[PDB]
Design a protein around this ligand. Sequence first.
Ligand SMILES: N#Cc1c(N)nc(SCC(N)=O)c(C#N)c1-c1ccc(OCC2CC2)cc1
Lengths: 333, 286, 51, 225
Amino acid sequence: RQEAEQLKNQIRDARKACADATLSQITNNIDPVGRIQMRTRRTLRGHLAKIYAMHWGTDSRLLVSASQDGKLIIWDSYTTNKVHAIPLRSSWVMTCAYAPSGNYVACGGLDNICSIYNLKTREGNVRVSRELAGHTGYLSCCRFLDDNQIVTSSGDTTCALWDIETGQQTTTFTGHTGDVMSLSLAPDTRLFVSGACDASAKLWDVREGMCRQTFTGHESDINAICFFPNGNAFATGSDDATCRLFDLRADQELMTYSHDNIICGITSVSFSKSGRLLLAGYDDFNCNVWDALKADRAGVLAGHDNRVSCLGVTDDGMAVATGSWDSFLKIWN
Amino acid sequence: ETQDALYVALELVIAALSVAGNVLVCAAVGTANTLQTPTNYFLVSLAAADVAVGLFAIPFAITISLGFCTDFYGCLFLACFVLVLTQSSIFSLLAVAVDRYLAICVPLRYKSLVTGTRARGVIAVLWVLAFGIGLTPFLGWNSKDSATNLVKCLFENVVPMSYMVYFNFFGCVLPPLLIMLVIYIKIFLVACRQLQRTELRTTLQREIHAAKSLAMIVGIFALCWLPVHAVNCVTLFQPAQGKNKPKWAMNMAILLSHANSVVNPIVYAYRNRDFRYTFHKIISRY
Amino acid sequence: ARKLVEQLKMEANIDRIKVSKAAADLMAYCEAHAKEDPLLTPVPASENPFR
Amino acid sequence: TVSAEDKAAAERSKMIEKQLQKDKQVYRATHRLLLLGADNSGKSTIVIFETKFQVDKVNFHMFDVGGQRDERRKWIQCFNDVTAIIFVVDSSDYNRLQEALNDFKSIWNNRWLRTISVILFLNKQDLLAEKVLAGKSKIEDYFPEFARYTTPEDATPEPGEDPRVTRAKYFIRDEFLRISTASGDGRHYCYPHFTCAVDTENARRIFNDCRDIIQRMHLRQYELL
Ligand SMILES: N#Cc1c(N)nc(SCC(N)=O)c(C#N)c1-c1ccc(OCC2CC2)cc1
C-alpha cells in the first residue's frame, strides 16, 4: 500500500543520479543544418472521404491507403497508377499495414476484428484470408513481424500477439490503465514500444511477455510514437503541441521540441533515414520539420487544406508521403 | 465626334476591367481543389462568358459604330458575334438562379439531382442555344432586300428591329427575368418563415437585410438590361417620336448593358465564403 | 493490488549509464551515416525516380 | 516508348477508376445519422449495429455502436460530418435520470460536434403514466423543484390525459430544454419529441427535422439567416 510511494521516490532519485549533462551542452558545437525546401512531386486522388492511415512498402514502390468509405487502395508511387481496390465490410477503419514480404495487408477499426487480406492469389482476385476476433475494444494500430505473426493494440488497455495459422493469440500485455493509441516496433524485431492514453509510454518484450521500462513526462494524451534507426531511442508526440525524445538505456528524457506559436495537437511522427530529421504532422493543416539534435525548425510542408493524419518515410529515404482529411495524398521530395 | 470618341473610351475602360476581373475569378477557381463543386461550374461559365464579352464583343461594337463601307455578310458577322455572348450570359444567370432555388427549396434531394455530369450537360445545351439564337439572321432575317444605301456598317442597316423586339426581347430576355423574380420572392418568403421560427427589433433588422440582399440582384439585372430594349420597342411601335430622338440616348444605354459584365463577379463570387477563404490563403502564402 | 509493487521491483534493479555516453553515441551514429540521407542532402536529378 | 506491361496496368487503372466513379454516386446520395443512448433505453426498437431505410425516395443510414465503454472521447471524432445525432432517453426510471442529463452535457459541449444538431426522443411514456398515476411516485424526493412547477400554457395536451401526466412529461422536457438553450449560438438546435414503445411515426418525424437542418444550413451559407 504505502511501499509504492517509497519505490517511486527511489526510482525518481535513481534516475536523477545518472544525469550528467543535457543534449544542448553537447550539441552546441555541430554546424546547423540550415533551411530545407520540399516540393510536391505527385498528387494522388481517388478517395471520397477522410484518409486515416498509410504505410509504405518494403521496396519503396507501393503503398496502401485506407479511408472512411471502407476501401483500401494500393497505388504505384512512380506512375500514379492503381493496382488494387479492396472493399471492406465495416466502413469504420482506422489502421492499415503492409507485409514485409509484399504478400499480405492488414486492416482494423471500430468493428473489433483484425482482417488479413491476401494479394498474390492464383485467381487474380482478393479474398479475406483470416479474421482475428479476440479483443473487446476498437483497434488502434497493428504491425507485422513476419508472414505468420502480428501485433495489435486496441482500446481495452491491452496489447496482443497473434499467430495467423492457429488463429488464437499467444501473449497479452495488460500493464496499462488507458486505451493504447500507438505502438512501434524495432529493427531487431525483439522489442516494441507502446503509448497509451494515461500520459505514459512503455517498452515491452515479445518473448518474455512482461514490461521492462516505463516512461513519463507528458501532461496529456500521447497520440503517435516512432522508433530510432539505431534502436536506442524513440520519439513521442502529445496534444500539448510537444514532442519528446526518450533514450532507452539511461531511462530518461533527452530533448523537448515545442514552440510558443503552436496550440493544436500532434497526429503523426516519423524519423528520417539517418536519424537527423524528425517530421511531425500537426493539426494546423500543415506539417513541420525538426532537427532531432538541435531543436530548430527547418521547414514547413504546408500544402494541405485540412487535418494531417498520415506520415511516412521510405526505406531508402527517397520521398515522404502525407495524407490528410481531404481525400488526397501527396508525395514530397 | 467628341461624343463618339468618349463612347469608345468608356467602352475600352469597361472591357479592360471586365477581362481583368473575370480572368481573376477563373484563375482562382482553376487552382483551388476545394472549389471544384457543381455550384461553382455555373460561376465559371458566367466568368468565361463575361471574358468573351469583354475581349471580343467590345471591339466589334466599336468597329460597327465607326461607320465605314464594306460588304453585307461581313458586317452581319460582327453583330451576330456580339449577340451570342450576351445571350449566353443571360442564360448563365438563369442557370445560377435555378441552382440556388434547388439548393434552398428542395434541400433533401439537392445532392441526388445536381451532379457534375448534369451540370456539364446543362452548360453544353445552354451554350449551344446561344449560338442557335445568334445565328438566326444568317438564315434570311436580314435587310439585304433594301441593302441600306457596298453597304454602310450600322447595326440598324443589317439586323431589323422586328427581330430585336419580337424574337430577342419578348422571347429570350423577359421570361428569364420573370423566373428569377419568382424564385427570389419564394426564397425570401422561406427565409422569413425560418427567421420567425429561429427568433422565438433584431428580427425585423435581419429580415430587412435579407430582403435588400435578395432584391439587389434583380435590381442590377433590370437596370442593366431594360433601357437598351426599351428604345427598340419605342422606335418600332411608334415611329413619330422615334424618328426624332436624341442621338446620344442610345449610346449610353448600350454602355449600361455592358456594365453588367463588370458587376457580376462582385455580386456572385466575391461575396461567397469559399472564394474569400481562397483569396486570403493565396494572398497570405504568396 | 500487490502486483504493482511486485512489478516495480524489477524496474528498480535496472542499471543506468551516464547521459553523456548516450548523447555521444547518438552524435556518432548521426555523423557516420550522413552520406546516405537523400532528405538531408539532395541528390542529382538524373538518379531521382521522382521527376 | 511505352511497353506492353505499362498499358496493361493502365487498363486496370481505368477499370478501377470506372468502378470508383460508379460507387461515388451511391455514396453521395445518403444522409447519415448517429444513434446514441444508454442501456435500458429502448434504442433497439426505434425505427443492432447498422440500419438502412428510405422514406419518400430519400435514403438514410443509422449507426449504433455499443461495443465500447462509458468513455467515448476518442472515437467521437470520426462522426464530424454526420447530418444529425439521435439521442434516446428513458423517463420511467427516476433515479437514473440526472446521470443521463450529464451525458447530454458531454455531447452538446464537445469540441468536435459544434455544428451537429441533436434529435431527442423521450421513450417509455406508457410506463411513465402508470407510475405517476400510482402512489409510488415520489418526484419531490428526487427532484424538489417539481412540487412548485406549473403547467405551461403553450403546451398541446392530448385529450383524455390527466393533468399530472402532462406536468410529469413537460417537467422532463423542460429539464433537457434548459441545457439545450443554456449554450450554443445559432450553430445547432434540439428537437424534442414524445415517443411510445410501439409508435410508428418516427420515420416521418426524422424526415421533417432532417429537412429543417439542411434548409437552415443552405440558408446560412448564403448569409441570409
Ligand atoms: N439594338 C441594338 C444595338 C445597336 N442599335 N447598336 C449597337 S453598336 C453601335 C452603337 N454605338 O450604337 C449594338 C451593339 N453592340 C446594339 C445591340 C447591343 C446588345 C444587344 O444585345 C441584346 C441582349 C439581349 C441579348 C443587341 C443589340
